Amino acid sequence: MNIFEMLRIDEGLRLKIYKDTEGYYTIGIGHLLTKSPSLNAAAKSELDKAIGRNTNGVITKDEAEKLFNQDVDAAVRGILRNAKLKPVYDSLDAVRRAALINMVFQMGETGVAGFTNSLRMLQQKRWDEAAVNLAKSRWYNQTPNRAKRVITTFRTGTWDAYK
Numbered sequence: 001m002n003i004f005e006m007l008r009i010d011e012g013l014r015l016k017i018y019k020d021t022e023g024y025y026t027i028g029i030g031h032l033l034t035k036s037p038s039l040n041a042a043a044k045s046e047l048d049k050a051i052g053r054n055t056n057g058v059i060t061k062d063e064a065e066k067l068f069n070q071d072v073d074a075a076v077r078g079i080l081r082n083a084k085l086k087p088v089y090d091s092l093d094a095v096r097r098a099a100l101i102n103m104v105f106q107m108g109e110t111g112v113a114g115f116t117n118s119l120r121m122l123q124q125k126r127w128d129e130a131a132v133n134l135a136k137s138r139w140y141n142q143t144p145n146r147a148k149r150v151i152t153t154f155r156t157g158t159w160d161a162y163k
């Protein structure tokens, strides 16, 4: 198992513009297009600009994967540039690094950076405590199944939640 496979399970693959769990316009493998309520312009506009062609709200599998590669790359690089995230990432093992990349992909660097307390516990290797803390969040309450998977990953340092 690896980051791409992990995120592919968490986000799924949709070739037509869709609304995410928060009602935002997304496409492919969790690629957010816009937070705006306008489909026919705004979202489709963003989509065409992202892809480089007149799409009509539908993309191909290769197109989805191209967006996905960019987004994973961005996530990693964002973590590495973030004063708050970098040190946590550096302190972790390969499996847990993947769990942090996942949270970053879903919520944004800024969002993850706010789990101050959890971050400090992860850095200290206090696995069970960090898991408990991570669960007291809107994140866990809104997308509990996915959150539990990421949390188990941090807790165990294994890919069990995904197998």
Ligand SMILES: [Cl-]
Residues within 6 Å of the ligand: 050
């Ligand atoms: Cl983009």
Ligand SMILES: [Cl-]
Residues within 6 Å of the ligand: 142, 143, 144, 145, 146, 147
């Ligand atoms: Cl969920």
